[PDB]
Amino acid sequence: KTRKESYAIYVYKVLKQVHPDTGISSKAMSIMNSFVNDVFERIAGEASRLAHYNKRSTITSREIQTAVRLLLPGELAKHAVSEGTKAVTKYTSA
Template sequence: MSHRLSCLRKTCTPSKLSPLKQNQGRQSRRLNGRHDCSRCSHHCCCRSNNIESFASYFTTVLKQVHMGLSLSQEAVNNMNSFMMDIFKCIAKEAECLAHNKSRTITSGEIQTSVHLLLSGEISKHTMSEATRAVIKYATSR
């Protein structure tokens, strides 16, 4: 078995836990919504409500594509879980591709990993959108 396939099979498995169960580990370290921070004594500035989510992007894109439609909370949660899983798979595949060369993951490794993980028309669409985003980022710098 090649290194790429063994790395992909080990790391890219969909998460078995629901998003709520995954966040319980984070919440157990909180005290009444605050972190146990050693920087300050009163803990009022150390609130952590930063939960990673793509939910705001779903509504923005949906408004651009179909104005009258909306998403239920269950649909948003399912799409968010799917996006997190795909993001992790792409990152792990890019890590395996860059493992032998250097410590930096470039857009080339990301592009190759997307091409390997996704197939068909979705791969072509993803490549064109990603190339457009990278060009837009490079010109804005």
């Protein structure tokens, strides 16, 4: 059978990080997978449009940051930005 990759193992790992005593069903897992795919596609499309607007041929972390600022509403966006920045900083340290 052909493999079908999905964001199920990672979503379960995050859930175990947040709620150690709470499980999840299959329909809820499908909903979360769809949510992750949708948000990924939205952010990537906004970043691609931003790169096209400024006549650049590269998607960088600045494009992702601006796409997150444009799409996510209010306080959410701010927090998201912080998280992303931290990751890159750690990724640079290693």
